[PDB]
Amino acid sequence: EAPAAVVTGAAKRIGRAIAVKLHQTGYRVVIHYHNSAEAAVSLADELNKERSNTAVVCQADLTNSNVLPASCEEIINSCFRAFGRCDVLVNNASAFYPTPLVGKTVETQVAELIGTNAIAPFLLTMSFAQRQSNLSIVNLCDAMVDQPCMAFSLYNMGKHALVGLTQSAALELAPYGIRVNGVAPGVSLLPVAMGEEEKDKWRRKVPLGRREASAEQIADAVIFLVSGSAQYITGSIIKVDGGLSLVHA
Amino acid sequence: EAPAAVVTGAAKRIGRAIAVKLHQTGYRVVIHYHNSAEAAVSLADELNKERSNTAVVCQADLTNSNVLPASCEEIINSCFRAFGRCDVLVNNASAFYPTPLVQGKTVETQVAELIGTNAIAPFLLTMSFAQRQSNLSIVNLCDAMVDQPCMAFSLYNMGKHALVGLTQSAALELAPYGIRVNGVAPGVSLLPVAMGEEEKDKWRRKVPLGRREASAEQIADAVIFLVSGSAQYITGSIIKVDGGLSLVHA
Amino acid sequence: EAPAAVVTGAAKRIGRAIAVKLHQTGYRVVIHYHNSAEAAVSLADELNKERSNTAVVCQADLTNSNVLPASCEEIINSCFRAFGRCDVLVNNASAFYPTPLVKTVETQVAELIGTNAIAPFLLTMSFAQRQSNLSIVNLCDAMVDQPCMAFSLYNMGKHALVGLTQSAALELAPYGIRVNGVAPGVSLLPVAMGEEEKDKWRRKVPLGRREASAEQIADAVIFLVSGSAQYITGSIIKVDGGLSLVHA
Amino acid sequence: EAPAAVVTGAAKRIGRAIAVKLHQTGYRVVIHYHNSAEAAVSLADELNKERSNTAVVCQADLTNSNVLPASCEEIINSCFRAFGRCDVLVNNASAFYPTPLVGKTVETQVAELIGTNAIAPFLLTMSFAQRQSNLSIVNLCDAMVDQPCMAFSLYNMGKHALVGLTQSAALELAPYGIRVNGVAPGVSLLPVAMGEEEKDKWRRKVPLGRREASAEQIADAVIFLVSGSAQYITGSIIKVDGGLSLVHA
Numbered sequence: 001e002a003p004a005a006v007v008t009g010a011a012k013r014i015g016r017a018i019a020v021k022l023h024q025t026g027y028r029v030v031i032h033y034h035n036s037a038e039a040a041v042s043l044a045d046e047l048n049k050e051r052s053n054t055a056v057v058c059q060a061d062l063t064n065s066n067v068l069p070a071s072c073e074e075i076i077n078s079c080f081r082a083f084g085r086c087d088v089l090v091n092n093a094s095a096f097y098p099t100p101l102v103g104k105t106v107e108t109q110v111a112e113l114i115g116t117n118a119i120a121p122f123l124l125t126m127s128f129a130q131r132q133s134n135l136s137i138v139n140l141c142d143a144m145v146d147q148p149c150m151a152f153s154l155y156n157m158g159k160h161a162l163v164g165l166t167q168s169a170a171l172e173l174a175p176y177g178i179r180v181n182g183v184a185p186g187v188s189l190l191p192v193a194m195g196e197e198e199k200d201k202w203r204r205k206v207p208l209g210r211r212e213a214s215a216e217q218i219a220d221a222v223i224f225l226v227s228g229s230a231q232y233i234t235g236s237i238i239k240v241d242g243g244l245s246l247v248h249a
Numbered sequence: 250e251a252p253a254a255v256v257t258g259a260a261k262r263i264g265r266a267i268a269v270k271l272h273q274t275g276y277r278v279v280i281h282y283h284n285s286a287e288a289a290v291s292l293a294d295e296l297n298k299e300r301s302n303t304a305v306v307c308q309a310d311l312t313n314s315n316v317l318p319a320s321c322e323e324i325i326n327s328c329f330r331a332f333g334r335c336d337v338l339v340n341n342a343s344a345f346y347p348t349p350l351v352q353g354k355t356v357e358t359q360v361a362e363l364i365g366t367n368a369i370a371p372f373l374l375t376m377s378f379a380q381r382q383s384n385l386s387i388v389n390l391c392d393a394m395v396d397q398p399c400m401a402f403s404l405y406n407m408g409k410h411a412l413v414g415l416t417q418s419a420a421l422e423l424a425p426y427g428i429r430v431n432g433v434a435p436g437v438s439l440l441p442v443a444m445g446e447e448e449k450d451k452w453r454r455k456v457p458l459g460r461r462e463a464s465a466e467q468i469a470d471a472v473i474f475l476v477s478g479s480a481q482y483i484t485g486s487i488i489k490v491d492g493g494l495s496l497v498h499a
Numbered sequence: 500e501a502p503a504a505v506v507t508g509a510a511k512r513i514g515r516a517i518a519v520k521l522h523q524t525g526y527r528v529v530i531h532y533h534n535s536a537e538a539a540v541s542l543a544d545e546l547n548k549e550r551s552n553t554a555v556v557c558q559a560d561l562t563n564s565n566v567l568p569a570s571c572e573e574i575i576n577s578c579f580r581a582f583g584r585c586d587v588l589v590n591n592a593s594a595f596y597p598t599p600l601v602k603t604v605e606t607q608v609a610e611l612i613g614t615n616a617i618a619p620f621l622l623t624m625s626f627a628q629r630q631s632n633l634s635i636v637n638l639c640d641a642m643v644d645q646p647c648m649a650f651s652l653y654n655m656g657k658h659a660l661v662g663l664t665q666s667a668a669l670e671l672a673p674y675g676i677r678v679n680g681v682a683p684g685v686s687l688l689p690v691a692m693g694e695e696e697k698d699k700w701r702r703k704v705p706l707g708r709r710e711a712s713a714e715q716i717a718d719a720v721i722f723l724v725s726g727s728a729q730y731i732t733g734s735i736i737k738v739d740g741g742l743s744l745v746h747a
Numbered sequence: 748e749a750p751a752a753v754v755t756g757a758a759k760r761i762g763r764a765i766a767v768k769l770h771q772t773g774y775r776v777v778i779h780y781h782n783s784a785e786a787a788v789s790l791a792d793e794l795n796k797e798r799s800n801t802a803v804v805c806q807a808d809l810t811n812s813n814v815l816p817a818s819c820e821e822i823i824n825s826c827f828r829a830f831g832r833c834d835v836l837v838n839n840a841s842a843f844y845p846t847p848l849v850g851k852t853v854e855t856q857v858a859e860l861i862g863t864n865a866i867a868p869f870l871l872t873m874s875f876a877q878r879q880s881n882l883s884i885v886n887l888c889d890a891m892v893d894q895p896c897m898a899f900s901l902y903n904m905g906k907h908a909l910v911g912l913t914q915s916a917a918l919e920l921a922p923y924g925i926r927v928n929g930v931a932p933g934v935s936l937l938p939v940a941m942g943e944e945e946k947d948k949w950r951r952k953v954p955l956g957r958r959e960a961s962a963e964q965i966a967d968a969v970i971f972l973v974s975g976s977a978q979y980i981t982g983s984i985i986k987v988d989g990g991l992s993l994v995h996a
């Protein structure tokens with residue numbers, strides 16, 4: 001009957017809004033989370049109140065390790081066990097912090113930034129395909145991949161690797177009827193780790209309305225890509241950045 | 250109170266699917282046409298017998314010339330005259346034919362039709378649409394294969410590349426005015442009617458997603474998204490609708 | 500003998516520096532010019548003092564018109580007439596000014612799309628028809644995907660030039676003609692453009708502790724023409740000190 | 748004295764030709780190798796015969812692991828130990844093999860394809876910069892990165908990451924006068940394994956002369972980017988693919 005979606009990093013911000021809107025469209029949802037157990041459970045409760053047994057939570061650290069393949073396998077399995085099926089994977093979870101070229105060890109930075117942003121999406125993608133009729137994956141990419149922030153080399157590397165994943169998996173999974181696409185926010189919901197006037201510095205850069213994307217605006221692009229309106233769309237990355245990537249220095 | 254859209258080359262194929270779909274969505278439409286007089290009127294009638302006073306036609310030759318600005322200005326004017334408003338512009342019209350570099354039209358006619366229809370008319374139409382002024386947006390029909398061009402199509406590929414520049418330049422410039430500019434990029438959709446079935450199946454075979462061409466309705470779907478309220482933060486984006494064709498290596 | 504190069508808009512700045520540097524490598528040069536007769540001739544004198552009968556000038560308006568194809572064909576003719584061969588085409592001439600969306604528009608079109616894209620397409624056609632290390636180098640723009648505001652016709656023309664670079668590289672490859680581009684960022688800024696505006700640009704350039712220079716451009720063209728680039732076609736080299744990498 | 752350069756994977760094929768041609772230009776070279784011990788030693792013999800004291804070898808495995816930072820630090824150190832300086836880093840070493848999405852473990856595959864192709868280049872770059880004239884880094888990328896081979900997702904993801912590193916490190920290292928650029932082969936020396944019939948299928952696709960690049964042709968591009976003729980060039984990736992990436996399906 002109803003289709004089923006996995007959303008990684010679904011407890012807060014963008015992943016939350018994606019999970020909410022998938023749910024409003026008639027998806028059952030696996031809300032993946034890492035540290036945000038309260039917000040994840042609270043979201044599952046709200047959604048289950050909307051419609052019974054349509055939302056489960058699943059905890060997994062998506063850092064790269066010897067166990068990441070098992071964790072990703074488990075995330076996919078939990079969808080099939082809760083719901084009988086897995087139609088949609090949304091790779092949203094993301095680590096994001098500076099790694100200057102010139103405080104964790106470098107190898108922890110690699111495991112986190114490359115782990116969450118690229119390897120976990122690869123492993124989730126393999127598990128999703130292996131366990132397989134409007135089947136699709138949506139990766140959360142970055143509209144500013146080709147004009148990186150200074151001292152974010154590892155973050156930028158993982159986001160570029162994700163673009164490669166989207167294109168590679170689109171090609172290889174097409175014969176199986178699995179579409180693979182991305183959504184590339186520019187400035188959306190801003191990190192809490194920064195002062196509220198730096199917030200205004202970015203908002204001023206945005207040609208369209210001089211404001212950041214709501215999480216819902218990102219979720220709208222995701223909804224379109226999983227829908228029947230995108231049945232011939234694969235390997236495409238839709239920028240949702242109000243024209244920010246187009247602005248020169 | 251119903252919004253209105255201009256669609257160029259709207260009589261047949263993809264532009265028709267776009268007008269039909271924008272109409273089913275509640276838009277009043279200007280069906281622009283060049284040579285397809287019968288097909289244009291036929292479509293405007295069928296649309297008008299759904300909701301009356303919703304579909305007008307507008308004839309224009311979108312070849313580059315010293316009257317092209319006036320014709321583009323007139324397409325836009327058609328929309329305000331019939332409907333009081335211009336909410337959407339879909340640049341769909343396009344000439345497509347080989348122009349070999351090492352070699353029955355003069356080169357300057359080729360420049361005029363391939364760069365005229367594919368780039369200059371969209372720039373002039375864009376200028377008039379912006380000057381004439383809400384969810385305002387423009388959608389340019391681009392080409393997914395623009396960076397892997399067919400042999401001998403340099404002028405056509407040039408026009409489509411120009412159209413990407415326009416898409417990005419105008420998104421940037423018109424953002425302050427609340428006009429979004431985005432594009433939709435087909436790979437293989439409806440093959441040229443001149444094309445033999447044997448040739449058609451060569452193209453079908455290339456496409457990773459189902460070994461078939463996009464339907465026109467599938468192209469139109471992406472245009473509907475881009476103009477909708479679900480795309481209110483998207484400007485300067487070009488969405489490929491090519492079932493993965495642009496990703497296949499030689 | 501000595502190979503021969505056409506360089507359009509060779510009289511001043513970057514096309515001059517490209518012309519001198521190809522000459523220093525042993526090329527014979529057609530210095531094309533439009534309004535720059537005195538500068539063009541002064542260049543050819545300088546190069547002819549160095550080796551006689553190695554530099555000719557040529558006048559053409561590269562604005563798009565019914566006579567553009569004739570003018571372009573005559574540019575390639577001048578190189579065969581004077582030197583018995585044409586080995587290298589450098590598409591450097593370029594018009595540059597704003598065309599806000601909100602001089603007639605069709606003159607804007609004829610200049611911005613004509614000189615920047617259509618003349619390069621016609622010259623490319625004439626070059627190819629009239630044929631070994633043969634190559635064309637198109638002067639492209641590194642900021643092509645981050646355009647300046649109100650520069651739509653300019654930006655359209657430089658995108659069209661990227662499509663030409665790619666389409667011509669593919670189609671001419673079976674003839675041993677390579678087609679490539681060099682994309683400056685800010686090099687020598689418009690001599691009419693103000694002074695505080697020019698220091699503002701240098702300040703954003705990552706490799707900016709250096710002067711951007713016309714010779715740095717020419718170096719990249721010299722590379723692409725050379726036997727060190729015999730396998731390179733359809734490539735566009737940015738020479739912009741990292742400027743295209745900097746976000747807003 | 749003469750400036751110096753580290754070339755990774757320099758024992759054979761493309762890395763060898765880069766090493767020869769940098770030596771020809773007057774560089775002192777560190778020939779990094781993993782398994783190819785005979786080849787590496789023999790190349791340093793030939794270069795030292797030409798000009799004594801100009802060529803050392805350095806063995807390291809460039810697989811990602813918690814010791815990869817020390818190995819990368821060691822390759823850099825070894826150039827300072829032999830020559831007192833390190834002017835040029837060429838990231839050439841690379842694993843390359845299919846990883847279908849539908850006898851190595853997946854974590855070894857990630858370690859080799861993402862380790863060698865991206866993480867080791869990032870650590871080498873970090874070590875190179877920390878230890879610090881015309882300083883520059885050249886990464887070996889892939890002209891086919893947006894038209895990947897089917898079932899090469901992990902490889903393609905690593906090469907995509909390498910593009911991000913190139914751009915990210917050009918921007919960040921620029922104030923220190925270090926330029927970072929890439930050279931992107933299409934078809935060059937075909938894998939030793941692969942059959943002669945497979946070799947001609949690939950040769951037939953190349954618009955420019957229906958042939959693969961010689962290793963020397965790739966090296967020429969490296970030479971250009973390290974020289975004084977490329978001093979305003981940073982963040983650029985030069986395709987050396989005879990037009991291959993331009994060819995549609």
Ligand SMILES: NC(=O)c1ccc[n+]([C@@H]2O[C@H](COP(=O)([O-])OP(=O)(O)OC[C@H]3O[C@@H](n4cnc5c(N)ncnc54)[C@H](OP(=O)(O)O)[C@@H]3O)[C@@H](O)[C@H]2O)c1
Pocket residue numbers: 008009010011012013014015032033034035036037060061062063091092093094095096112116140141142143184185186187188189190191
């Ligand atoms: N927000 C923007 O402006 C913007 C701009 C460009 C791109 N994006 C992209 O859009 C996506 C979502 O944006 P966002 O701002 O909502 O992301 P975010 O808040 O920075 O992070 C999203 C979630 O990812 C999960 N995560 C982080 N580290 C993890 C680890 N080691 N293992 C497992 N999960 C982990 C976290 O879950 P828990 O809280 O459960 O620990 C976190 O809440 C990301 O892929 C991001 O890169 C966002």
Ligand SMILES: NC(=O)c1ccc[n+]([C@@H]2O[C@H](COP(=O)([O-])OP(=O)(O)OC[C@H]3O[C@@H](n4cnc5c(N)ncnc54)[C@H](OP(=O)(O)O)[C@@H]3O)[C@@H](O)[C@H]2O)c1
Pocket residue numbers: 257258259260261262263264281282283284285286309310311312340341342343344345362366390391392393434435436437438439440441
């Ligand atoms: N078909 C595909 O597979 C495909 C692939 C890639 C991109 N696209 C793009 O998608 C869009 C729609 O595709 P399509 O195949 O439906 O286009 P098409 O059939 O080739 O042409 C669409 C319409 O353009 C009009 N047109 C042509 N030259 C004109 C001129 N000088 N002045 C005014 N109008 C002119 C024609 O209208 P009249 O009939 O009134 O003369 C024609 O019916 C195009 O922009 C195309 O470049 C299509």
Ligand SMILES: NC(=O)c1ccc[n+]([C@@H]2O[C@H](COP(=O)([O-])OP(=O)(O)OC[C@H]3O[C@@H](n4cnc5c(N)ncnc54)[C@H](OP(=O)(O)O)[C@@H]3O)[C@@H](O)[C@H]2O)c1
Pocket residue numbers: 507508509510511512513514531532533534535536559560561562590591592593594595610614638639640641682683684685686687688689
């Ligand atoms: N300088 C930069 O910052 C920069 C940045 C990005 C890209 N570029 C590209 O690099 C190239 C050369 O740079 P540049 O600044 O030296 O060039 P430029 O000074 O802008 O002009 C190049 C020459 O082209 C000729 N030209 C202009 N309009 C013409 C027309 N309508 N007909 C015929 N010839 C015409 C002119 O020759 P006459 O003097 O004979 O009239 C002109 O001096 C250009 O293609 C440019 O787009 C430059």
Ligand SMILES: NC(=O)c1ccc[n+]([C@@H]2O[C@H](COP(=O)([O-])OP(=O)(O)OC[C@H]3O[C@@H](n4cnc5c(N)ncnc54)[C@H](OP(=O)(O)O)[C@@H]3O)[C@@H](O)[C@H]2O)c1
Pocket residue numbers: 755756757758759760761762779780781782783784807808809810838839840841842843859863887888889890931932933934935936937938
């Ligand atoms: N060949 C092509 O047609 C082509 C096409 C596109 C891109 N490229 C790129 O160009 C560069 C060189 O090409 P190539 O064909 O010469 O590469 P290659 O022969 O496949 O490999 C170069 C060297 O990398 C080293 N290497 C591999 N795995 C390693 C590990 N785990 N640790 C340390 N070193 C390791 C090997 O050294 P040992 O032999 O010492 O074990 C190997 O000889 C590569 O970056 C490649 O991706 C090549």
Ligand SMILES: CS(=O)(=O)c1ccc2nc(N)sc2c1
Pocket residue numbers: 093094095096142186187188190191
């Ligand atoms: C504040 S931002 O627009 O630079 C940005 C950019 C990317 C990003 N990824 C995350 N997981 S949060 C985040 C925030």
Ligand SMILES: CS(=O)(=O)c1ccc2nc(N)sc2c1
Pocket residue numbers: 343344345392399436437438439440441
């Ligand atoms: C090569 S194709 O047949 O998919 C193709 C590609 C572009 C194109 N543009 C038109 N106006 S019709 C058309 C057809």
Ligand SMILES: CS(=O)(=O)c1ccc2nc(N)sc2c1
Pocket residue numbers: 592593594595640647684685686688689
């Ligand atoms: C914006 S710029 O000043 O770097 C620039 C950009 C492009 C350009 N083209 C010319 N012919 S002059 C010129 C100047």
Ligand SMILES: CS(=O)(=O)c1ccc2nc(N)sc2c1
Pocket residue numbers: 841842843889933934935936937938
């Ligand atoms: C033969 S190929 O052009 O598919 C190819 C492509 C990439 C590659 N990378 C290596 N390290 S060897 C190698 C061979």
